[PDB]
Amino acid sequence: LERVIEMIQNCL
Amino acid sequence: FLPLVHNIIKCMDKDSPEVHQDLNALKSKFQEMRKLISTMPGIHLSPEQQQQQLQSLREQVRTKNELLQKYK
Amino acid sequence: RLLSALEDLEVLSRELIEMLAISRNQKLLQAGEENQVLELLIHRDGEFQELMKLALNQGKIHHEMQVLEKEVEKRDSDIQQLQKQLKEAEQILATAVYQAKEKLKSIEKSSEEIIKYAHRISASNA
């Protein structure tokens, strides 16, 4: 959930 | 490529001094440049169409980015 | 158009040399001998000194094409990772846990009743 949100905000 | 030809044209306009035993430089200058005309990136199509293609693909790039904002 | 403007320069120069050298070429008078052809060369140079600058803009315009396509690839390269994590996301979740809910919870409730039920037929195996 945090990785996806980080993925959502970031290019990767 | 393209900036060089303007220099080649400048050089070709300042040659052919006199008539004697001479070097066929003017003959090698139109041939050298004629190759440069055959290698210009953009004479194959009009400039307006290329610019229109830029905005059309910027529309999707913007739309994808704009739809990437609703993504959040 | 550009290539045509150059074959004129060579042809005009070639004919100019012949009649400044060949004395018998007076009868065969053609282009590259008068002052009108020289003026034509100047106009060709002027036209040839305009089509290059238009092309220089085209090359720069085409360069802006590649950078945009790269962004499209970058905006689409991550999609391959996006699709990879969606299938992973679905598999992570335990779907249809309602079966486990009505099964496990029913066993739990009563935990005080199962213990009492098993205390009276114990040692049920040989």
Nearest CA-CA partner of C29 in C13, C16, C11:
C16
Nearest CA-CA partner of C44 in C103, C96, C98, C1:
C1
What DSSP state is assigned to residue C120?
S
Q: What is the per-residue DSSP string for C57-110?
A: HHHHHHHHHHHHHHHHHHHHHHHHHHHHHHHHHHHHS---THHHHHHHHHHH--
Nearest CA-CA partner of C42 in C1, C8, C18:
C8
Experimental method: cryo-EM
In Å, the largest CA–CA distance within chain A is 16
* Nearest residue of A to residue C74, measured between CA atoms: A11
* Nearest residue of A to residue C86, measured between CA atoms: A4
Most A-contacting residue of C71, C76, C78 (CB-CB within 10 A), to test interface: C78
Residues of C with CB under 8 A from a CB of B: 2-3, 6, 9-10, 13, 20, 45, 48-49, 51-52, 54-59, 61-62, 64-65, 68-69, 71-72, 75
Between CA C35 and CA C46 the distance in angstroms is 17
Q: Work out the burial of residue C32: count CB atoms within 10 Å of its CB; fewer than 13 is exposed, 13-18 middle, 19 or more buried.
A: buried
Between CA C53 and CA B12 the distance in angstroms is 18
Q: Do B2 and C56 contact (CB within 8 A), yes or no?
A: yes
What Rg, from alpha-carbon coordinates, does chain B have?
A: 23
Cβ separation A9–B71 shorter than 8 A: no
State this model's resolution in angstroms. 4.5
* Nearest residue of A to residue B70, measured between CA atoms: A8
Between CA C59 and CA B6 the distance in angstroms is 15
Q: What is the per-residue DSSP string for chain B?
A: -HHHHHHHHHHHTS----SSS---HHHHHHHHHHHHHHT-TTTTS-HHHHHHHHHHHHHHHHHHHHHTTTT-
